[PDB]
Amino acid sequence: KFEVLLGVYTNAIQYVRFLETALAVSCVNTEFKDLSRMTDGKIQFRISV
Amino acid sequence: MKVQGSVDRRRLQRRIAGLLPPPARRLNISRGSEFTRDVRGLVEEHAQASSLSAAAVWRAGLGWRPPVFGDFLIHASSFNNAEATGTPLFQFKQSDPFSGVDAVFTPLSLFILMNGLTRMANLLYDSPATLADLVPDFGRLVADRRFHNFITPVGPLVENIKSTYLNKITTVVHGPVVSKAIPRSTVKVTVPQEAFVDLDAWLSGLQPCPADARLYVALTYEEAGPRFTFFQSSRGHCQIMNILRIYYSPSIMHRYAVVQPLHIEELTFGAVACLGTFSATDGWRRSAFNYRGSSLPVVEIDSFYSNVSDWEVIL
Amino acid sequence: PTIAHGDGRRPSKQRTFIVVKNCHKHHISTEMELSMLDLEILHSIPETP
Amino acid sequence: MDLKVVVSLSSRLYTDEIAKMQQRIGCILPLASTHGTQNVQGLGLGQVYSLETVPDYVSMYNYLSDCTLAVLDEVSVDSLILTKIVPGQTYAIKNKYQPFFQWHGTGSLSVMPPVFGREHATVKLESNDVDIVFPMVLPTPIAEEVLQKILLFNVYSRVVMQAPGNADMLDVHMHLGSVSYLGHHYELALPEVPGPLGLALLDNLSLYFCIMVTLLPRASMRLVRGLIRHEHHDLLNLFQEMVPDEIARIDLDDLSVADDLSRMRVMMTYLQSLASLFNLGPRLATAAYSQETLTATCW
Structure with missing residues (x-):
């Protein structure tokens, strides 16, 4: 006769997300669809004195 | 108003579902209708795999690495039933009768034949005169220095079906070491910790680290008999020999008396072979044997790809 | 749970x-006592007050 | 089974170098250690070969054989994408060396240090204050010829000390200087002074030579001593009618096959060991080639 056994499982996860943290006020978050393709990027400030 | 998060699970599920290979085709011979249906599926698959006409018939988009098993039969005296699985073994050649026994050899058996580890080897083998009967010209082949040509490496054993006199043995020859009984459970390879010299630390900008580190095997005729040594190195086949000769020089200095000026057949100090390749940047693991008189510490190394080499002269 | 790492x-x-x-x-x-007389008269039937 | 290595640059590209790096696509260089993320200085061969330092080429061979070898795949403004050389894999290769050597089918290729010219196989990235040094892949014949010339020079330099200048001009720069090819001749860079760690090979050579010269056979010497005087041969153009009297002095005794045979056995056994001291280079086997593309399939 074949014996079938049951052994219980538990998970210790906790729900955590980035926006619900307060640090997300430090940055500004945009989702870029295809980021691996972008080779390089730059920002060009022009300041008059 | 949940955030929805930063990454999406639909993408992961889809791409992994794409990554799974199609299932193997079971064929059901006991029942007629299932047999017929699997045969229909087989003819459709051959039509789907060999016709250059269509494009969905092109399936090659996106390795076979078991070992090559070789089976040897040996006497139940020339092998302990308890000796651990995966220890590298070395083989000997009989002259006329080969079917009777193969006489495959273990490193402790070599340490016994060659005359702590001694006591362990005696607690495995109290009366090893069969060991002397396996090689009749041991006393002859130490001097003829032809001892290494006949000792051919076989490498780690997987399984040994146990019988009264004979033993059935399965040996990994080429490829990674793996088992058979199950979905190919892996094994590891063990060598005693003493009588093993780490030649990457014996001399110890920054030296570069290769991917793969190799294990060599060498056989030396000293005035205190012959002896065997395995070396965990990584540099190169052209440098391991030089470093080894530099290592043995203090033992080589002693051979001025034994060498014969007239007969040049005894001069060779030893030979080096390459057994296999394992992962560097890891090291190895320490364990003791669990036998009745077990006191020897042993190194054991994972990820062994068995690629045996021949004996090369060094002096 | 585990964190993702970006190093080498x-x-x-x-x-x-x-x-x-x-x-x-x-x-x-726990040990308890009962004297033999305490256990005997239970079998006897009392009529007079 | 699948290995893609990205090397990140701290500083920028500095386009002045990117064009030369980009026509430098598809070629070999040895990297320091196998990880998903690499350092910039360990990438090229620039560590072992400092500009101010005198070249010792056996040390370059020793470094080169130890490190893993990689195929340059793509240069990006901040990235270096290289797949590496798995020992059991087959891949294409395409090469352009300024010392330009033409390949054949099924010809084994050797990897060597850039002995010919520093400016040739090295590209300076002064933006990081580094210099990427590419190794040299040559057909095995010319490789072993050049290595032999290098060792013979490392010897004869120690030799020609305190001799007439007629030794200084000739052996030092007649055969040890140039390497020929079909209607072609390339000079070599020569170490001004004899380099250490090079003769470390030569010590082992002397050991094998002592052991071999203890067991030389006799009949071959008699055959040669006869053939030089009685007959004429092209291989025997080297020896003129006069014989080196050393052979006459060793030759004196008679012959016996039983003596020749054991000597021959031990000589054969000591000839299998030389291939370890002669290779000193990872070899790649050719499977197919196209001169119209200069893109072979090595292995």
């Missing part, structure tokens, strides 16, 4: 382990 080291493997505990057993024993 091999990625950290997700970890699930098995933790087995042992159940202790305790025994408690």
Whole structure:
């Protein structure tokens, strides 16, 4: 006769997300669809004195 | 108003579902209708795999690495039933009768034949005169220095079906070491910790680290008999020999008396072979044997790809 | 749970382990007395007050 | 089974170098250690070969054989994408060396240090204050010829000390200087002074030579001593009618096959060991080639 056994499982996860943290006020978050393709990027400030 | 998060699970599920290979085709011979249906599926698959006409018939988009098993039969005296699985073994050649026994050899058996580890080897083998009967010209082949040509490496054993006199043995020859009984459970390879010299630390900008580190095997005729040594190195086949000769020089200095000026057949100090390749940047693991008189510490190394080499002269 | 790492080291493997505990057993024993006369008269039937 | 290595640069590209790096696509260089993320200085061969330092080429061979070898795949403004050489894999290769050597089918290729010219196989990235040094892949014949010339020079330099200048001009720069090819001749860079760690090979050579010269056979010497005087041969153009009297002095005794045979056995056994001291280079086997593309399939 074949014996079938049951052994219980538990998970210790906790729900955590980035926006619900307060640090997300430090940055500004945009989702870029295809980021691996972008080779390089730059920002060009022009300041008059 | 949940955030929805930063990454999406639909993408992961889809791409992994794409990554799974199609299932193997079971064929059901006991029942007629299932047999017929699997045969229909087989003819459709051959039509789907060999016709250059269509494009969905092109399936090659996106390795076979078991070992090559070789089976040897040996006497139940020339092998302990308890000796651990995966220890590298070395083989000997009989002259006329080969079917009777193969006489495959273990490193402790070599340490016994060659005359702590001694006591362990005696607690495995109290009366090893069969060991002397396996090689009749041991006393002859130490001097003829032809001892290494006949000792051919076989490498780690997987399984040994146990019988009264004979033993059935399965040996990994080429490829990674793996088992058979199950979905190919892996094994590891063990060598005693003493009588093993780490030649990457014996001399110890920054030296570069290769991917793969190799294990060599060498056989030396000293005035205190012959002896065997395995070396965990990584540099190169052209440098391991030089470093080894530099290592043995203090033992080589002693051979001025034994060498014969007239007969040049005894001069060779030893030979080096390459057994296999394992992962560097890891090291190895320490364990003791669990036998009745077990006191020897042993190194054991994972990820062994068995690629045996021949004996090369060094002096 | 585990964190993603970006350095040169091999990625950290997700970890699930098995933790087995042992159940202790305790025994408690109390001793009580009853004198033979206390147990005898239970079998007898009393009529007079 | 699948290995893609990205090397990140701290500083920028500095386009002045990117064009030369980009026509430098598809070629070999040895990297320091096998990880997903690499350092910039360990990438090229620039560590072992400092500009101010005198070249010792056996040390370059020793470094080169130890490190893993990689195929340059793509240069990006901040990135270096290289797949590496798995020992059991087959991949294409495409090469352009300024010392330009033409390949054949099924010809084994050797990897060597850039002995010919520093400016040739090295590209300076002064933006990081580094210099990427590419190794030299040549057909095995010319490789072993050049290595032999290098060792013979490392010897004869120690030799020609305190001799007439007629030794200084000739052996030092007649055969040890140039390497020929079909209607072609390339000079070599020569170490001004004899380099250490090079003769470390030569010590082992002397050991094998002592052991071999203890067991030389006799009949071959008699055959040669006869053939030089009685007959004429092209291989025997080297020896003129006069014989080196050393052979006459060793030759004196008679012959016996039983003596020749054991000597021959031990000589054969000591000839299998030389291939370890002669290779000193990872070899790649050719499977197919196209001169119209200069893109072979090595292995």
